[PDB]
Design a protein around this ligand. Structure first.
Ligand SMILES: [Hg+2]
Ligand SMILES: [Hg+2]
Ligand SMILES: [Hg+2]
Ligand SMILES: [Hg+2]
Length: 159
């Protein structure tokens, strides 16, 4: 069933969101729109900054003029490649910039969080509460997205 699959994925997104919220110490909006909110690269770039306090990272989020998403996105990619993590754990610019594989981005955040907490450089990702749920609207939206793509959801369990 697509609904059950949608339910599963929404919990993974919620877990990734909560982990970064805890890391950035800030509120990051609804889970149903979290993936889309990552496309401009700001949040991921802030994650980098946090782990590289000795480096100044120019992050762009101007509301007066359009900024280059890839600039913030490449900051995150350089970081996950720079710490030597396997390519299988990452995502590509297109996946997030064009939103062609947002779940991969979420999987990437899960992977990163595991490696980092494992090296205890950060608190661990936390499995969603068992009673954690979402509105049918949010779930149906996920189902529609799955019906519009050929994307296959990543293997979170194996993490
Ligand atoms: Hg779930
Ligand atoms: Hg965290
Ligand atoms: Hg933008
Ligand atoms: Hg990653």
């Amino acid at each position: 069933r697509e609904t059950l699959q949608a339910y599963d994925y929404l919990c993974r997104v919620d877990e990734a969101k909560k982990w970064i919220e805890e890391c950035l110490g800030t509120d990051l909006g609804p889970t149903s729109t979290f993936e889309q909110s990552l496309r401009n690269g700001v949040v991921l770039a802030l994650l980098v900054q946090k782990f590289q306090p000795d480096k100044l990272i120019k992050i762009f989020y101007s509301n007066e003029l359009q900024f280059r998403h890839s600039d913030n996105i490449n900051k995150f990619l350089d970081f996950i490649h720079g710490i030597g993590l396997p390519e299988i754990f990452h995502f590509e610019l297109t996946d997030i910039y064009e939103g062609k594989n947002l779940p991969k981005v979420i999987y990437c955040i899960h992977a990163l969080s595991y490696f980092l907490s494992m090296q205890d450089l950060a608190p661990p990702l936390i499995k969603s509460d068992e009673n954690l749920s979402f509105t049918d609207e949010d779930v149906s939206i996920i189902v529609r997205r799955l019906r519009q793509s050929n994307v296959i959801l990543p293997n979170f369990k194996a993490l």
